Amino acid sequence: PLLHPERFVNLGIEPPKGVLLFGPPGTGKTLCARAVANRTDACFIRVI
Amino acid sequence: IDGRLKELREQLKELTKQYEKSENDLKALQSVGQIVGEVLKQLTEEKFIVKATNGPRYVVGCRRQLDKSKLKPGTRVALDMTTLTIMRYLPREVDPLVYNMSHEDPGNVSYSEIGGLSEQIRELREVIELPLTNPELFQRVGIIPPKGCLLYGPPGTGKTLLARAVASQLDCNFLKVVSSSIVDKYIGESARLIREMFNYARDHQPCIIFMDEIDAIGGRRFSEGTSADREIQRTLMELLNQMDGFDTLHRVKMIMATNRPDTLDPALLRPGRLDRKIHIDLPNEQARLDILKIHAGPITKHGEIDYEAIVKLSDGFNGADLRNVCTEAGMFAIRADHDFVVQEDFMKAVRKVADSKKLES
Amino acid sequence: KIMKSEVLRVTHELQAMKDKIKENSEKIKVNKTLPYLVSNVIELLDVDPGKCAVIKTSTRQTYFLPVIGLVDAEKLKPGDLVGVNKDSYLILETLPTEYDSRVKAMEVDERPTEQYSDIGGLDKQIQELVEAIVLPMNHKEKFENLGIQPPKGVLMYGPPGTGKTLLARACAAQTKATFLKLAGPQLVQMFIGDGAKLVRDAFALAKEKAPSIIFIDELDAIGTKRFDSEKAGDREVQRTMLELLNQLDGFQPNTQVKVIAATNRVDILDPALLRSGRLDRKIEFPMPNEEARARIMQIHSRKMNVSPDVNYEELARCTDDFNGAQCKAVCVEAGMIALRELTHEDYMEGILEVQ
Ligand SMILES: Nc1ncnc2c1ncn2[C@@H]1O[C@H](COP(=O)(O)OP(=O)(O)OP(=O)(O)O)[C@@H](O)[C@H]1O
Ligand SMILES: Nc1ncnc2c1ncn2[C@@H]1O[C@H](COP(=O)(O)OP(=O)(O)O)[C@@H](O)[C@H]1O
Ligand SMILES: Nc1ncnc2c1ncn2[C@@H]1O[C@H](COP(=O)(O)OP(=O)(O)O)[C@@H](O)[C@H]1O
């Protein structure tokens, strides 16, 4: 969705409505940080 | 002749002169008002202690026209905003503003809107009104006035409608209280709620407490014997011993609009109990045609007065159902977007409601 | 005749006195443009030996402006939030009141845009409730001249996913009138009379804003079937149920502001909310058949153009006991997988995912 290459037409209107990256204490949110780095300046905030 | 428009010009001048006198009273006042306080202490004939509602109390004089007998201690008064002197004394009021009286006397013209069982309405009025009108005679001779009356006919003729209408000769305020709403928690301290509602009636002394549903669904499901055991009956005994709520002094009665008089705790029908019960059932053919006529009253269309044929198809239909019948006739006409309602529309409405109730029963 | 001199005085008097009205209104209106004190009306009807007012200022004081010296007690009833002179200590002009914190805008949508065409399956029921609600909005004068007051209480009972919410918002849009949504399950507040106050101000807002649609959800949650038990007995929520009942009769004249209550099982309610003037139009919302489910998911995926010529017949065969929400989820599961299945096989797993 951040690339916005295909969400509009080929796949239904809007990309998947949500993402719940859960899991036991471990890899959780490291992939989120990696996605933040790989994406644009619209970068995340870690709220608790 | 321009002089014949003098009447129209006169009307215009009167119309604008009403506004002009209104604005004259609005601008001529242009007042700052007086501040509100309470007589904290009279002190003496000349100086008085008046405390504002929000702090400071002052030693002020009194209004010349007023007198100490009109001022009195601990009474709301008005002080001058600047010179700080008593200007006028005002009455005060408090309001609990919660769970108070909801339905009041105005709109009591349903004596003609009931139609059916006018003799029954007359009998209930005969039972209720006289102690409600002049209870002092009951004390004067040493006889206890009745508490209220019982009403049958679970879905039938409007029991609440009768409660509203009969208060026409009563000039009282009917109150629609639910048995469950009065009992709340399943404790004998449910009498607190009855105390509050009886205090509300006492404040609005000319009142009649119309009960909604005491024998919860008397036709089926759970009665007084089933489900809650004796809770309803003890809560009713509370209102029964309330009967010493100054019946001579208090213009309060209680109508019990049960569905079915079957499970009504026969211990509550002895003398000193609810006592009187008036029989209301599904309307007969005569009452049915009469209530059909009064329902059609507001409806002015072509149609016909062929009420008996409608009665034939719609026999044993409650008054609320017949009101729904007239509304369904209007609904059919408007769904057709026809400004006319004929007997065929009535036939369609009657068939629709009959099939609906037949399927639901 | 006398008309010439009479009208010569009449035009001059009217225009000059309206100029005086303008002058007084401006001198009061800049003060009306600077009102500062809240108006807690402790109304005392002091008739001059007509009325009067006690105003509780924001700065904690009492002002007894005589005979309410600018506005009329008919429109000014004992309440709050009506303009008060900061210098003249007088009732200045009315202004909108406060809608009870939560009800100021709980979830009020100013205007729904969902259309009737995108929903369906229960077309007979939807047309019935359209005739019972939207027609009393557009052709209200029709009912007025007929003489039959339209009913207000409509209860959509049926399992979730049957489209009650979409149908209600679409009906409100068709009426082009105000729509107010009530979140029923969260109306159970610990605060005493809190639900009663919420319902009171919700009805007040609906009355103040057009013939509205009061869409109260979870009517089963709101009202119990009076199946009292030792664990609980619906003691407190009965106050709120009675408050709603007493609020149902407020809008009988000028029949406006309709009440729409959504639930799954109608039987969980006592025979008290069900009445001719109260909730009367009890409308069934069943799970759509295969044809209706296929048509609904087709309409939902109408804005998707990826797999041509998918008749959704295998989908209808595989949509056993599914809701409109479930069909939408099935179609958008394809809307999520159909990148780069696709035709007639990217639909089954949507239901399998949820459990
Ligand atoms: N796949 C991974 N590769 C490298 N380091 C990882 C990985 N998963 C977890 N870590 C390490 O774990 C630590 C915290 O990782 P992460 O930020 O994913 O979790 P968190 O926010 O602490 O919470 P939780 O452990 O509950 O998910 C870091 O030191 C990170 O380097
Ligand atoms: N005899 C009647 N005449 C006119 N309206 C009636 C009559 N009986 C019932 N109704 C209508 O039924 C509605 C409610 O009646 P209700 O008091 O519930 O009757 P019941 O208690 O027997 O079910 C009222 O709005 C009233 O208009
Ligand atoms: N006829 C229909 N057409 C399109 N979508 C529908 C239909 N019926 C239900 N839905 C979907 O169901 C969801 C609404 O679910 P909900 O309102 O909770 O169902 P219910 O009103 O039966 O409780 C919406 O997101 C909508 O997409």
Swiss-Prot record, chain A:
| PTM notes | Monoubiquitinated by RNF181.
Where ATP is bound, by residue?
Answer: G23, P24, P25, G26, T27, G28, K29, T30
Induced by what?
A: Expression is not cell cycle-dependent and occurs throughout the cell cycle.
Disulphide bridges:
none
- Taxonomically, the superkingdom here is Eukaryota
Q: Where in the cell is it found?
A: Cytoplasm
Q: Which family does it belong to?
A: Belongs to the AAA ATPase family.
The entry describes its oligomerization and partners as:
Component of the 19S proteasome regulatory particle complex. The 26S proteasome consists of a 20S core particle (CP) and two 19S regulatory subunits (RP). The regulatory particle is made of a lid composed of 9 subunits, a base containing 6 ATPases including PSMC2 and few additional components. Interacts with NDC80/HEC; this interaction is detected only during M phase. Interacts and SQSTM1. Interacts with PAAF1. Directly interacts with TRIM5.
Q: What does this protein do?
A: Component of the 26S proteasome, a multiprotein complex involved in the ATP-dependent degradation of ubiquitinated proteins. This complex plays a key role in the maintenance of protein homeostasis by removing misfolded or damaged proteins, which could impair cellular functions, and by removing proteins whose functions are no longer required. Therefore, the proteasome participates in numerous cellular processes, including cell cycle progression, apoptosis, or DNA damage repair.
**Entry protein name:** 26S proteasome regulatory subunit 7
Q: Which organism is it from?
A: Homo sapiens (Human)
User: Which section of the whole protein is represented?
Assistant: 194 to 241 of 433
Swiss-Prot record, chain C:
One Gene Ontology term of the biological-process aspect is:
modulation by host of viral transcription
Which SMART domains did the record assign? AAA
Question: GO cellular component terms?
Answer: cytosol; extracellular region; ficolin-1-rich granule lumen; membrane; nucleoplasm; nucleus; P-body; proteasome accessory complex
One Pfam family in the UniProt entry: AAA
Write the record's keywords in alphabetical order, separated by commas.
Answer: Acetylation, ATP-binding, Cataract, Cytoplasm, Deafness, Host-virus interaction, Intellectual disability, Neuropathy, Nucleotide-binding, Nucleus, Phosphoprotein, Proteasome, Ubl conjugation
| Residues the record lists as Phosphoserine modifications | S307
Q: Where does ATP bind?
A: G158, P159, P160, G161, T162, G163, K164, T165
- Which locations, inside or outside the cell, does it occupy? Cytoplasm; Nucleus
Molecular functions (GO terms): ATP binding; ATP hydrolysis activity; identical protein binding; proteasome-activating activity
> Is Membrane set as a keyword in this record?
no
Summarize subunit and interaction data from the UniProt record for this chain: Component of the 19S proteasome regulatory particle complex. The 26S proteasome consists of a 20S core particle (CP) and two 19S regulatory subunits (RP). The regulatory particle is made of a lid composed of 9 subunits, a base containing 6 ATPases including PSMC3 and few additional components. Interacts with PAAF1.
The similarity comment for this entry is:
Belongs to the AAA ATPase family.
General function of this protein: Component of the 26S proteasome, a multiprotein complex involved in the ATP-dependent degradation of ubiquitinated proteins. This complex plays a key role in the maintenance of protein homeostasis by removing misfolded or damaged proteins, which could impair cellular functions, and by removing proteins whose functions are no longer required. Therefore, the proteasome participates in numerous cellular processes, including cell cycle progression, apoptosis, or DNA damage repair.
Q: Which disease is it linked to?
A: Deafness, cataract, impaired intellectual development, and polyneuropathy: An autosomal recessive disease characterized by early onset of deafness, cataract, severe developmental delay, and severely impaired intellectual development. Patients later develop polyneuropathy of the lower extremities, associated with depigmentation of the hair in that area.
Q: Which PANTHER family match?
A: 26S PROTEASOME REGULATORY SUBUNIT (PTHR23073)
Please give the name of this protein: 26S proteasome regulatory subunit 6A
The source organism is Homo sapiens
